[PDB]
């Protein structure tokens, strides 16, 4: 077994998979800030520095709408994965106890 683990790294795919999944989802969430959602630009400060309050609001509305919508979607993925992982955790606990 010591040799098997030392040579082959495919055994730990499951744990590697979970870490990759969370990293992937987070990266997409981070990347989403680069999106425009039909706005003039995707830099909040730039919009504040170009238009005026009665004019910059519409752009912000799209930025907030898109960004807020993206966040909850990521939140949903996390908890669903958490729902799965927690189920896995309970199974492991029984294996430990049993």
């Amino acid at each position: 077994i010591q040799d098997s683990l030392s040579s082959t790294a495919s055994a730990l795919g499951k744990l590697q998979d979970v870490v990759n999944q969370n990293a992937q989802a987070l990266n997409t969430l981070v990347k989403q800030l680069s999106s425009n959602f039909g706005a003039i630009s995707s830099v909040l400060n730039d919009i504040l520095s170009r238009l005026d309050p009665p004019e910059a609001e519409v752009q912000i509305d799209r930025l907030i709408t898109g960004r807020l919508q993206s966040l909850q979607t990521y939140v949903t993925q996390q908890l669903i994965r958490a729902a799965e992982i927690r189920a896995s955790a309970n199974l492991a606990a029984t294996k430990m106890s049993e």
Partner: protein, 49 residues
């Protein structure tokens, strides 16, 4: 149809006086607010007459 094309760059721009020049009938901005005009830096500008 023969609208002139002009280029301006490598200089400082004072739109405040131009904004204060209310003599112009049509002084409208779309991508920017004239109030904020005097506080932005640009790669270059194009002017037509």
């Amino acid at each position: 149809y023969a609208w002139n094309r002009k280029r301006i760059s490598n200089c400082v721009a004072d739109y405040s006086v131009l904004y204060n020049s209310a003599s112009f009938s049509t002084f409208k901005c779309y991508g920017v607010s004239p109030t904020k005009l005097n506080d932005l830096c640009f790669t270059n500008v194009y002017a037509d007459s």
